[PDB]
Every structure is written in structure tokens, then in C-alpha cells.
RNA sequence: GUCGGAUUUCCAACGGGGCCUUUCCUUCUGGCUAACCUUGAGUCCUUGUGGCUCUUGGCGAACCA
């Protein structure tokens, strides 16, 4: 069911991940019952400077609620299969362009659709399940911003080998830099 | 004092500041899992509870509210979170 | 009440610089305080500063060298025609050579010399030197 | 910029604790809080004597660096400091002012007590206030022996100790001189403990 | 401070304080300079090599001279574990 | 810093930086929505409700666990009261004081304080009036008010 | 270089404009250019679906009403 799981676009990686998906529900009773209604839209591959890459997975928003109840095992298996790839699960959130001074008719574009909210959501998903404890922008003496995200201590080990990957992923999707840190 | 770090204050001097005047304000209260033996059921009760919480079933008063904190009744199991 | 944020920000910074401290803790912060500070920084009147999130409106910690004689906010953000700039800079700054009366124009916030160059003008925020 | 030698020696620390230099007074100026280690349940504070040490080494490097070993001035109107300072002067050749510091000894070239230091060291920055005040009129660096409630106005490199008990005083002065001489070359090696007893510096009355 | 011919034209570039980066001026008789001695492996201090600091009369009057000296020295290799960046 | 007095106290709920749920919480959204409506039906005000859920049922913040505010939850299910609730309590207070005043006509301080309360009512009122949460003609009068609380 | 000014390349400065990044003017129907082909034809030179203009119906980008 590699054409059953996707949404109207078959590519190599997407078919391979949908097929791995199938072979992964085929070895379980509860995981298969949960993963079957879980569709995902598209996939993107983006590299890190370690020699390996990362597989970002775009998900329709109303399904992420369910996706989060499985994501630990799912990424476990999908990482044991697709090796030398760091697997990340993002939502698909459509951003609306800011109303121009001559923007004609637009409905009151909601805050959930704002560029800010969306990027701070990309941050949120980027490090599931560990929880963001506070952010901190540094303003350098060269005129460069650096957004410093701070994380918890409950799921350090689940993400510890993935930090650098985020710094690539995020940079590819937002254009902004980022550094991660953990409370002493 | 002429030079110091404000982004990274010592957790010592930080835990002694007022609730609001820290680097980021956040509560100093917590929640409590509690049990009266004559029920075997864990209720959750806010540390500075204002209403005197009764157990689910029995009409027993787990804690009376006082000024700042909640005074939990004699002989009651509790645990943070 | 707190009527201008920029006012209290720059006030704090100034006072701190007089005491000869090295860092200040501005609250709250604003798009405007941010931009004003970036302009302060571009000419190196302050070192580096950090914005502290807290969901409300952030705090800021500014580090400063010692190069700051006084920064201030001119209060009711008067409008300024382009020819008018000359008069403001003739009052506020201590010298024709340096200093900066920094404006708010429809082409962003910037010092007055950048306003000279881009040939625009707007309202007048404050002044640095 | 200092060798693994200069670190605090077990023997030294023993001396200090024997003389209770670690016993700080009951109140702490906000200016000397970093020196304070912990506070005892009776309300008496404890000084990081490691820091006492490093500040001693510092004051020593400074006393050393002055070209003419005469210019450095030890001062005390405080009783105990008199005795201690005198010796300090003897072994280090610095000039001493025990007892009554005549006012205008740093201004006013006309008086006979006129001296032109290049560093002042003071026992008690409160009882010897005027010498500090006066040093401030003429670009003269002050290095003091401060308790945790001593006014740190016009002093650089305070040495946190205990201005109250005579043992603490004498000990600190002595350690100071010793460190200076170790720096000059006068006491060749660093393994060799001072042939001279600290008790020479103590205040004795018959 | 230069003129057009590119030549300096002041009486003197003045001494700045080290703690405060403010200028020390000529009538400031509370300002101060501190020579600390560079040392050998043998624990001898060389007669003519100093790490020197400047302090404004302001900082010494305000009673921050000490703490300032600490930080400065510690950062410039003289001390270690005396001065904390956090409080 | 405190209208109608000299004092300048700061004292309020702080709020956790965490926008989302606490880890140690394990009930559904529909659970607490159900709980809320259940409590409103009993006749409660949004405030008392949230206090109850915070105390007994270990809900830190209503808007956290359920992405909606308590008032929005009640308005969604047709339990919004005609007048907003703080205003309700203000008016209640002024009614009380006015009654005590009917008995006691010599209590000057009560007369005074009645004036303050009435003023706060007025200001609040005009706010609600503007954002259309109160009908544009609605007005506080003493007789009107006693009729409202009775 | 040139018989006091001249412009190209090397180089920064400093400003302006238009794009690609989820994302800026949107159309609806009638007229006018060139571009994509359908299509058999013509002029040239490498034996040509190469280059330059035609004949009916539309795609897309400007254009006017
Ligand atoms: Mg207030
Ligand atoms: Mg008022
Ligand atoms: Zn019970």
C-alpha cells in the first residue's frame, strides 16, 4: 500500500517510506490499527554536515494529535530501517502573506497562519517529545540574530544525537539560525 | 556588581527572588497526589488550594485553606506532582 | 503609567552607563526598542544584547562598552521635513562630526545620516551619542 | 600567570585556621559578599581563605613590583597592627607609620612627616580612615586588610581576614612580608619555610 | 584626532579606565594605576615587566575598585576562582 | 497603581511558561469540558469553576488543557449570563452598600465608598457597552440594580 | 587610451529596481504584436524541425477597450 498511504504524488523516497510503513504495520496488531488511518502528505530530504542526511515528513495538521502517540516507536523503526537518515515529523501549516497596503479583499487572516506562529510551531515539532523551556535571541555585534532554544531533561537521550540535524533542517525551512541548550 | 551575568543567574539567588521578579516569572506552587487510607484513591490537590477539598467518595476534608498554603489533614499520604 | 516603552528603555540604559555598570535589564521590549538598539549597535554604542522570551513581552539584557555619553528619546515624535533635520541635529548632538538623531521613516527606523542618503524622512525617535 | 607553586599549602592553611582568619564579622557589606563562603548558625560568617590567599599573593606581587622598596608604606593606628607593621617594615625595608598618622602626611610638602609613597598598605580601613582618604588625594593605591564589614571605599585589593583578633592580624602581615621576600629572591627556594616565627608580629604588653 | 594632512593634532590621547572604559582626566587625583609583577618559574618577579591597570577616581570612590580589580586580573590571567561572572 | 486607593501592591497569579499541558496530566479535553459545563449548570461563575478545577481536579489552566477559555466554553453551550460577571459582582456590592446606607444615613465613609463603587460600575459598563457585550442602551440605576440582584 | 577631459576591465563604497523562497493586483468579454505548435510552402548557407516570413485553430507573457 505505498500509493494508499500518500496524497497524490509518488516519488522514490516517498514510496520507499510508505512501503517501510506497510511492512511496519504488518508486524503488529495495535500499531497497524493506529498507523493505517495515519496518512502523510510529502517527504523532504535535507543534509547535515556530518556525512548523513535527514528525512523531514510533512503531515496534515489534524492527524499530528494521533501521530504523537506513536512517534517514538515509529521513528525508532523507521530509523532502524532507513539507516544513515535522521527522521523528523513536521506538520503542514499554510502561512498567509501579510496584507499589503493595496491588498484588495482578504478575510481577517488568523494568527495561527502568521509567519511567527508557524515558525514557533516548526520549533515545537522539531524536538518532539522533549519540551521547550524557553527561547532566547542573541543580537550580535555583526548584525546577526541567533535564536537559542532551551530544552528539558526528561527526554535528552532520545534527541541528543539529532541536535545538529535540526540546525540544518530548520535552516533549510526558515532561513534562520538556531542553537540548542539544556539547563544545568 | 559592576559586572555580572543576568542571563545566567545562580539558581541559589534565583530561588530566593520574589515570584515575579525572576528572569522569567513562573509559579512557586505545585500539585499533590494524596490518599486517605480508608479509600485507596489518589486525588490531586493544588498546594495553595482555596477550597477545602473533599475526597471523591467519603465526606472527609483533605485540607483546609490558610493564608498562603494548604494545611493537609493529620495522617494523610501525599507526594509531589 | 508606562506611556512610552522606548523612554524607559533608554532611561535605564543611560542611568546604568552613568553608574558605570556593564549590563542592564530592560523591560519590556518592542520591535522599536529592538530596532533602536540595532542602530545603536551598528555604530557600536553598545555591545551585544539579548532578547529574553517569556510569552508576555520579552525582557532585554544589554551589554555596554562605555562609549555612551547619553542616549535619549525625544518625546512627542514630531514630524520632520527633510530640511528640518538640520535644526534637530543642530540642537541635540554635541558636534557636527558625530552623534545620531535617529528617525522613524516609512523606509524603516534609522539614523539621520541614512535618512540623508536614502532621501527620506518621517518622525523623530531619539538621539545617540 | 602563576606556577603550581603559589597555590595554598596545607601548612599555610593550618596557620590561618589556627589564627582564625577564617572568622568573619557578623555583617557583610554588599561589596564583600563574594569573599564570604558560608555563615555559621551563630551568625558568624566564613571566609574563603583560598581567596584570602590569592589576594595575599596579589598584594605581594604589587608590593614587589615597586622599584624602590622604601616607598611602600605600611600603616596602622590600630594597636596590634603597630607591632606587626614595624616588623613588616624591618624585613621588607618599607616605611612604617605605627600609631598616630599625622594629617596631611601626603599633602603638604612643608610638614616634616611628608612622604611620597607609591603604594599604601593599611591594617584597618576604618580606624586608619584618614590615611586612605588622604591617599585618595594624590593617586596613591591602597591595599587594605578588610573584615567583611570594612568600608571598601578607596581600596583596591582588599585582603579579607579578621581585623579584630591579634593573631589574625599578625599572621596576615607576616604572610604578606614572607610572600614579598619570596618574590624578591631573598628567601631563595619555595620549599623552605620561613626561619622567622609569626609570633614576632604579635602584640605583647607587659 | 587628525586633520586633513593625516597628522595627529592633540595635546594627548588620555588614559582610559580599565573597569569603566571612561576617560581619566588630568585633575582626577583619585584615579590610579596598578602595576602587578610578572613572575619567573623560580618565583622571582622581574624588575621591569608589569601587568598594569587603570582605574577612574569614580570607581574607587564608589567602592567598586576592588571587585573591578578582581574581575580584571582574573580575566587577565593573574587570579583564578576569586571572581564569579554570576552572583 | 490601584485606582481608588493609595496602595501599590503587586500580587497575582504568575503563569507557567509552558503553553501546553503538564506531563503528569492524563484526562481528555472532552473530560474537562464536560466537567466545566457540569459545574456551570450547578449555577457557577467562570471564576469559581476554574478555582474548583484547579483545586480538586488538578487542572492547572483551563485554556491549556482545552484550547478554549472558560467563558468561551460556557458561551458555546448557551450558559453565558446576560451581564458579564465582574460587573455582576460590582453591582452586587453597590446594592449591598446602598442598602446598608438606607438604614444608616450618617455613615459618611459608606457614602464615599458607595461613590467609588458606582464609578467603577460606570467605567466597566461603558467598556462592555462599546465592545457590544452589553446592549448600547443598557444603563445602571439604583432601582434598576436592586431589581437585577433581587 | 588621449590629443585639460574621454570610457572599459580590477575593486570597493552607497543607494534604486525586479524576482525565487507556501507569498502580490485580480479578473470578465471583445480588438493588436511576437513567442509555442498544427501545416504545407518559400529565401540562405554546414547534406537540416538549424536561421528569416506566410496560411486556419488555441496555450502562455505584455498590450488596448
Ligand atoms: Mg505597580
Ligand atoms: Mg484615577
Ligand atoms: Zn476518601
Whether A144 and chain C come into contact, CB under 8 Å, resolves to no
Instruction: Name the closest residue on chain E to residue C66, using Cα atoms.
Output: E21
Rounded CA separation A110/A95 (Å):
10
Q: What does the block give as the cell for D9?
A: 599549602
Instruction: Name the closest residue on chain D to residue E33, using Cα atoms.
Output: D141
Comparing CA positions, the residue from D71, D82, D85 lying closest to residue D115 is D71
Are D22 and D46 a contacting pair, CB within 8 Å? yes
F72 and F99 together in one domain: no
CATH of the domain at C128: 3.30.1490.10
Residue ranges of domains in chain D? 12-206
Tell me if the bond preceding C28 is cis, omega within 30° of 0. yes
Q: What does the block give as the cell for E7?
A: 597628522
Range of the domain at A24: 1-184
- Per the rule left: phi > 0, alpha: psi between -120 and 50, beta: everything else, D153 is beta
Which are the contacts of E70, defined by CB distance < 8 A and separation ≥ 6? Answer: D34, E79, E82, E83
Which are the contacts of C47, defined by CB distance < 8 A and separation ≥ 6? Answer: A141, C41, C62, C63, C64, C65
* Domain topology for E1-87: Hypothetical Cytosolic Protein; Chain: A; (3.30.1230)
Q: What does the block give as the cell for D169?
A: 592580624
Are A143 and C42 a contacting pair, CB within 8 Å? yes
Residues of F in contact with B49 (CB under 8 A): 55
| Residue E15: CA count within 13 A, CB half-sphere | 17
Comparing CA positions, the residue from D173, E64, A7, A104 lying closest to residue C21 is E64
Q: What does the block give as the cell for B63?
A: 485540607
Q: Give the pairing of strands B77-80 and B63-65.
A: unpaired
Instruction: Name the closest residue on chain F to residue C2, using Cα atoms.
Output: F1
C8 and C41 together in one domain: yes
Are B19 and B67 a contacting pair, CB within 8 Å? no
**Range A154-159 contact pairs with CB under 8 angstroms and sequence separation of 24 or more:** A154/A130, A154/F23, A155/A129, A155/A130, A156/A130, A156/A182, A158/A72, A158/A129, A158/A130, A159/A127, A159/A130
Residue ranges of domains in chain E? 1-87
CATH of the domain at F145: 1.10.287.10
Residue tagged 485553606 (cell numbers): B65
State whether the Cα torsion E21-E26-E30-E32 is positive or negative: positive
Range of the domain at F127: 81-150
C122 and C63 together in one domain: no
Rounded CA separation F100/F111 (Å):
10
Question: How many domains are there within chain F?
Answer: 2
Alpha helices per DSSP H over D93-151: 129-135
Residue at F7 is within a domain: no
Residues of F in contact with C54 (CB under 8 A): 17
Partners of E2 in the beta sheet?
Answer: E8
F34 and F73 together in one domain: yes
Q: What does the block give as the cell for C4?
A: 512610552
Looking at domain D12-206, its CATH architecture is 3-Layer(aba) Sandwich (3.40)
Q: What angle, rounded to 10 degrees, do the helices at D49-65 and D166-184 form?
A: 50
Spatial strand order of the sheet with A85-92 comes to A43-47, A53-60, A85-92
Question: How many domains are there within chain A?
Answer: 1
Residue tagged 543567574 (cell numbers): B9
Rounded CA separation B43/B62 (Å):
9
Could you give phi then psi for residue E23, rounded to 5 degrees? Answer: -80, 140
C-to-N gaps above 2.5 Å in chain A, after residues:
none
Are D52 and D159 a contacting pair, CB within 8 Å? yes
Residue tagged 455613615 (cell numbers): F107
Are D75 and D120 a contacting pair, CB within 8 Å? yes
Helix (H, G, I), strand (E, B) or coil at A142: coil
Residue tagged 604588653 (cell numbers): D205
Q: What does the block give as the cell for F119?
A: 464609578
Partners of E55 in the beta sheet?
Answer: E32
Cβ count near A29 (within 10 Å): 7
F128 and F93 together in one domain: yes
Rounded CA separation C42/C37 (Å):
9
DSSP notation for C66-89:
S--S-EEE-SS--B--TTTHHHHH
Q: What does the block give as the cell for E36?
A: 602587578
Tell me if the bond preceding E63 is cis, omega within 30° of 0. no
Give Dmax over CA atoms of chain A in angstroms. 57
* DSSP assigned state of A113: G
Question: How many domains are there within chain C?
Answer: 2
Distance C9 CA to ligand 1 centre (A): 17
Comparing CA positions, the residue from C118, C107, C128 lying closest to residue C6 is C128
Comparing CA positions, the residue from D152, D145, D205, D204 lying closest to residue D173 is D145
Q: What does the block give as the cell for F47?
A: 471564576
CATH of the domain at C12: 3.30.1370.30
Range of the domain at C83: 69-129
Q: What does the block give as the cell for A39?
A: 496518512
Range of the domain at B23: 1-81
Interchain proximity C52–B2, CB inside 8 Å: no
Which are the contacts of D30, defined by CB distance < 8 A and separation ≥ 6? Answer: B1
Q: Give the pairing of strands C71-73 and C49-52.
A: unpaired
C1'-nearest nucleotide to the CA of A173:
G21
Q: What is the dihedral of CA D185, D187, D191, D193, to 10 degrees?
A: -150
C1'-nearest nucleotide to the CA of A98:
G23
Are C72 and C116 a contacting pair, CB within 8 Å? no
Helix (H, G, I), strand (E, B) or coil at D144: strand
Distance E22 CA to ligand 3 centre (A): 70
Q: What does the block give as the cell for C92?
A: 541635540
Could you give phi then psi for residue C62, rounded to 5 degrees? Answer: -105, 130
**Best residue in D49, D50, D58 to probe E by mutation, most E CBs within 10 Å?**
D58
C1'-nearest nucleotide to the CA of C113:
G14
Rounded CA separation D162/D169 (Å):
7
DSSP notation for C26-73:
E-S--HHHHHHHHHHHHTTSS--EEEE--SSS-EEEEE--S--S-EEE
Structure obtained using: cryo-EM
Could you give phi then psi for residue D22, rounded to 5 degrees? Answer: -75, -15
DSSP notation for B28-55:
S--EEEEE-TTT---EEEETT-SS-PBP
F126 and F73 together in one domain: no
F64 and F118 together in one domain: no
C1' (G14) to CA (C119) span, angstroms: 12
C4 and C62 together in one domain: yes
Are D142 and E61 a contacting pair, CB within 8 Å? no
Residues of C in contact with E64 (CB under 8 A): 20
- Per the rule left: phi > 0, alpha: psi between -120 and 50, beta: everything else, D122 is beta
Rounded CA separation D107/D117 (Å):
11
Residues of F in contact with B43 (CB under 8 A): 56, 58
Q: What does the block give as the cell for E38?
A: 610578572
Rounded CA separation D169/D60 (Å):
16
Amino acid at each position: 500500500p505505498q500509493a494508499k498511504i500518500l496524497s497524490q504524488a509518488p516519488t522514490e523516497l516517498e514510496l520507499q517510506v510508505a512501503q517501510a510503513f506497510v511492512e511496519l504495520e504488518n508486524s503488529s496488531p495495535e500499531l497497524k490499527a493506529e498507523l493505517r488511518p495515519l496518512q502523510f502528505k510529502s517527504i523532504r530530504e535535507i543534509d547535515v554536515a556530518g556525512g548523513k542526511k535527514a528525512l523531514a515528513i510533512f503531515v496534515p495538521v489534524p492527524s499530528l494529535a494521533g501521530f504523537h502517540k506513536v512517534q517514538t516507536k515509529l521513528t525508532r523503526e523507521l530509523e532502524k530501517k532507513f539507516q544513515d537518515r535522521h527522521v523528523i515529523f513536521l506538520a503542514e501549516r499554510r502561512i498567509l502573506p501579510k496584507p499589503s497596503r493595496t491588498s484588495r479583499q482578504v478575510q481577517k487572516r488568523p494568527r495561527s497562519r502568521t509567519l511567527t506562529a508557524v515558525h514557533d510551531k516548526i520549533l515545537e515539532d522539531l524536538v518532539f517529545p522533549t519540551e521547550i523551556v524557553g527561547k532566547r535571541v542573541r543580537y550580535l555585534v555583526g548584525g546577526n540574530k541567533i535564536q537559542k532554544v532551551l530544552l528539558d531533561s526528561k527526554d535528552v537521550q532520545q534527541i541528543d544525537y539529532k541536535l545538529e540535524s535540526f540546525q540544518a533542517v530548520y535552516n533549510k525551512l526558515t532561513g534562520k539560525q538556531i542553537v540548542f541548550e539544556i539547563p544545568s | 556588581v559592576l559586572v555580572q551575568d543576568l542571563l545566567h543567574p545562580t539558581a541559589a539567588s534565583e530561588a530566593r527572588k520574589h515570584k515575579l521578579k525572576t528572569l522569567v516569572q513562573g509559579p512557586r506552587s505545585y500539585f499533590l497526589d494524596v490518599k486517605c487510607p480508608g479509600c485507596l484513591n489518589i486525588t490531586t490537590v493544588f498546594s495553595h488550594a482555596q477550597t477545602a477539598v473533599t475526597c471523591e467518595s467519603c465526606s472527609t476534608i483533605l485540607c483546609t485553606p490558610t493564608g498562603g498554603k494548604a494545611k493537609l489533614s493529620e495522617g494523610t499520604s501525599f507526594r509531589r506532582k | 503609567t508606562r506611556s512610552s516603552v522606548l523612554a524607559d528603555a533608554l532611561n535605564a540604559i543611560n542611568n546604568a552607563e552613568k553608574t558605570g555598570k556593564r549590563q542592564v535589564l530592560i523591560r519590556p521590549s518592542s520591535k522599536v526598542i529592538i530596532k533602536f538598539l540595532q542602530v545603536m549597535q551598528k555604530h557600536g554604542y553598545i555591545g551585544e544584547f539579548e532578547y529574553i522570551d517569556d510569552h508576555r513581552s520579552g525582557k532585554i539584557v544589554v551589554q555596554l562598552n562605555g562609549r555612551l555619553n547619553k542616549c535619549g528619546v525625544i518625546s512627542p515624535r514630531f514630524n520632520v521635513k527633510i530640511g528640518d533635520i538640520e535644526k534637530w541635529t543642530a540642537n541635540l548632538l554635541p558636534a557636527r562630526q558625530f552623534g545620531y538623531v535617529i528617525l522613524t521613516t516609512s523606509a524603516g527606523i534609522m539614523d539621520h545620516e541614512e535618512a540623508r542618503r536614502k532621501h527620506v524622512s518621517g518622525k523623530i525617535l531619539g538621539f545617540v551619542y | 600567570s602563576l606556577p603550581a607553586t603559589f597555590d595554598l599549602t596545607p601548612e599555610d592553611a593550618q596557620l590561618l585556621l589556627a589564627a582564625n582568619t577564617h572568622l568573619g564579622a557578623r555583617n557583610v557589606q554588599v561589596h564583600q559578599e563574594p569573599y564570604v563562603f558560608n555563615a555559621r548558625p551563630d551568625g558568624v560568617h566564613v571566609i574563603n581563605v583560598g581567596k584570602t590567599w590569592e589576594k595575599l599573593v596579589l598584594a605581594a606581587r604589587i608590593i614587589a613590583a615597586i622599584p624602590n622598596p622604601e616607598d611602600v608604606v605600611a600603616i596602622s593606628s590600630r594597636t596590634f597592627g603597630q607591632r606587626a607593621v614595624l616588623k613588616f617594615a624591618a624585613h621588607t625595608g618599607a616605611t612604617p607609620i605605627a600609631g598616630r598618622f599625622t594629617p596631611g602626611s601626603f599633602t603638604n610638602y612643608i610638614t616634616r612627616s611628608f612622604k611620597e609613597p607609591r603604594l599604601v598598605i593599611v591594617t584597618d580601613p576604618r580606624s586608619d580612615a584618614q590615611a586612605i582618604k588622604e591617599a585618595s588625594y594624590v593617586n596613591i593605591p591602597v591595599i587594605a586588610l578588610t573584615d567583611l564589614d570594612s568600608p571598601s571605599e578607596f581600596v583596591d585589593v582588599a585582603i579579607p581576614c579578621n581585623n579584630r583578633g591579634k593573631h589574625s592580624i599578625g599572621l596576615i602581615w607576616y604572610l604578606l612580608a614572607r610572600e614579598v621576600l619570596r618574590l624578591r629572591g631573598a628567601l631563595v627556594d619555595r620549599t623552605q619555610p620561613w626561619s622567622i616565627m609569626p609570633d614576632l608580629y604579635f602584640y605583647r604588653f607587659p | 584626532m587628525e586633520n586633513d594632512k593625516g597628522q595627529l593634532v592633540e595635546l594627548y590621547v588620555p588614559r582610559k579606565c580599565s573597569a569603566t572604559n571612561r576617560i581619566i582626566k588630568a585633575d582626577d587625583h583619585a584615579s590610579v594605576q596598578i602595576n602587578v609583577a610578572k613572575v619567573d618559574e623560580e618565583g622571582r618577579a622581574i624588575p621591569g615587566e608589569y601587568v598594569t591597570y587603570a582605574l577612574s577616581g569614580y570607581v574607587r570612590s564608589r567602592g567598586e575598585s576592588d571587585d573591578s580589580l578582581n574581575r580584571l586580573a582574573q580575566n587577565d590571567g593573574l587570579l583564578k576562582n576569586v571572581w564569579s561572572y554570576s552572583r | 497603581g490601584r485606582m481608588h486607593s493609595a496602595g501599590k501592591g503587586i500580587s497575582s497569579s504568575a503563569i507557567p511558561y509552558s503553553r501546553n499541558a503538564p506531563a503528569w496530566f492524563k484526562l481528555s479535553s472532552e473530560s474537562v469540558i464536560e466537567q466545566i459545563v457540569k459545574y456551570a449548570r450547578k449555577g457557577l461563575t467562570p471564576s469559581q469553576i476554574g478555582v474548583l478545577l484547579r483545586d480538586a481536579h488538578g487542572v492547572t489552566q483551563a485554556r491549556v488543557i482545552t484550547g478554549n477559555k472558560i467563558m468561551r466554553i460556557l458561551k458555546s453551550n448557551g450558559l453565558a449570563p446576560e451581564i458579564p460577571e465582574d460587573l455582576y459582582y460590582l453591582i452586587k456590592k453597590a446594592v449591598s452598600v446602598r442598602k446598608h446606607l438606607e438604614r444608616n444615613r450618617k455613615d459618611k465613609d459608606a457614602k464615599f465608598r458607595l461613590i467609588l463603587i458606582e464609578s467603577r460600575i460606570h467605567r466597566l459598563a461603558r467598556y462592555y457597552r462599546t465592545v457590544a457585550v452589553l446592549p448600547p442602551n443598557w444603563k445602571y440605576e439604583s432601582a434598576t440594580a436592586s431589581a437585577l440582584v433581587n
